[PDB]
Amino acid sequence: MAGALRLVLGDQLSDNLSALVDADLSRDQVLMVESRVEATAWKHHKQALVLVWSAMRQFAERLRARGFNVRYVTLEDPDNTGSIGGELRRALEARAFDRVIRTACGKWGLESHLLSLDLPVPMETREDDRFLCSRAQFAAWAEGRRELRMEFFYREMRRKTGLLMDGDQPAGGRWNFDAENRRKLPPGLRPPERLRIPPNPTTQTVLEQVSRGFDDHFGEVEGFGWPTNPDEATAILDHFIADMLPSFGDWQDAMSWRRPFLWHSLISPALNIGLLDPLDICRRAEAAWREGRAPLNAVEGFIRQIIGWREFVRGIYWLKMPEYAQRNALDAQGKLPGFYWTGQTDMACVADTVRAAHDHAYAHHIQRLMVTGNLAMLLGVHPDAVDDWYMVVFADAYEWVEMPNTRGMATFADGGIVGSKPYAASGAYIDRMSDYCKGCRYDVKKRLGDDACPFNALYWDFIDRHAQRLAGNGRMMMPLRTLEKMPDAEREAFRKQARALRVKMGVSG
């Protein structure tokens, strides 16, 4: 009858967390740790550190106001062992407990370590039921499927959640209103100004501590504008729903120089730590369509990203780990170019993506996928180095979501499990979808020579290198038959260009 020690991690800041919902407030204690192991396993963006630790401190205060005894161990505490496991042991030695209760986390290596810890009391691990699909439900869906197609998973999630269902039929009589007709912004359309959250007093304190104590971590911390508690996160969501969602579908794949947010929701950093709930977000978007304040194609496209892609990538991560993290289907062995960290490249699209990561800890999906992701795949950068960049530079990065999007969708190192095909593209794609190329030093109409857009020769050398494997993929027919129709002299020409680019960029050779 000594009570339970209830662990809450930095991405578990939800009243409904499974480790909390049956607490005995008169006997139990919550443990929350600012852990330098977790902060440095990858050296996360300064803004990611500020976000998590500010949000953590405020959640602890919200728990105390509700009657919880909270043992909170800060980054400054001189007795903090630095690790979750060390701090569990320290808490169990400070007073009597009958058991530890925790919620399964979002990183296989940490989950595996915690499951193996030898503690003086039992540890009970509960599934994270903030997600809409359980790990077991995904495994059951996936069983027997030669290929995992997000669309079919998504339809099941629509039926299960009831989102955008009119009786037993999808709203509007189609499941998906996606189409491949998206374009860049018209020249006269200026993306709108976005709501930012000025740091509250707790956030300001953490910002000062991170600026002094983690100066070697990537990124700028001045200008921090992310929400750090439920009120701030709800303000950001309200702004998206009212002001941005009606145009969300039109501009979902566009890119505009030094306009990093466009009409995206900017909620992933808050949702991924628990400050928003995925079902609530989707119900709010559905209500906007049902009340006549947004079109169905925009609302369906937004919901598909949360109950479709987000749940799907989590499902594949837990289905396939730990071997997933060792897959390298294309035998990529190159080094990551230094300009991924410094931004010092004349490729305007790449430079702008690195700039947004540095200044905001954010870039939207198409930029992550088709600029820096595609480039790394075409260069043949080793997947560990690519994962290590995406885990550092964005404030929504956790392995369960980063890895299937990066090792899977963006670079095909998983051989197509997540994405079915490589999302390889030349500069022509970036030119069509962005305003980058007019002002770029390089010429997107050229493949060879010092003025040619590097993506153009790298794209064709990638298709060439992997032509047989992509033939046995079936989803690359338009490019492979273009390749086969080029004369040997044309193919040799772009092979030499791509080889020279990989040496110049510090990748290999």
Ligand SMILES: Cc1cc2nc3c(=O)[nH]c(=O)nc-3n(C[C@H](O)[C@H](O)[C@H](O)COP(=O)(O)OP(=O)(O)OC[C@H]3O[C@@H](n4cnc5c(N)ncnc54)[C@H](O)[C@@H]3O)c2cc1C
């Ligand atoms: C290489 C690469 C790495 C990525 N790494 C991460 C990561 O570490 N963390 C992360 O949360 N997302 C990651 N994504 C997915 C996606 O790019 C981000 O979720 C999105 O950019 C967040 O911006 P937003 O909140 O403005 O989203 P919106 O464009 O407004 O989309 C709405 C919501 O849908 C979800 N979402 C959309 N696309 C995806 C997706 N492919 N996978 C999962 N959720 C999705 C998010 O919850 C997002 O908030 C990655 C994508 C790629 C291509």
Ligand SMILES: Cc1nc2c(=O)[nH]c(=O)nc-2n(C[C@H](O)[C@H](O)[C@H](O)CO)c1C
């Ligand atoms: C930056 C950071 N800091 C902490 C921390 O101080 N304490 C903690 O308990 N968790 C932290 N996390 C989250 C974990 O590193 C990890 O990514 C998630 O628990 C994965 O589910 C992160 C990401």
Ligand code: SF4
């Ligand atoms: S020309 Fe090539 S490198 Fe320059 S912005 Fe366009 S796609 Fe990017």
Ligand SMILES: [Cl-]
């Ligand atoms: Cl993680």
Ligand SMILES: [Mg+2]
């Ligand atoms: Mg000590």
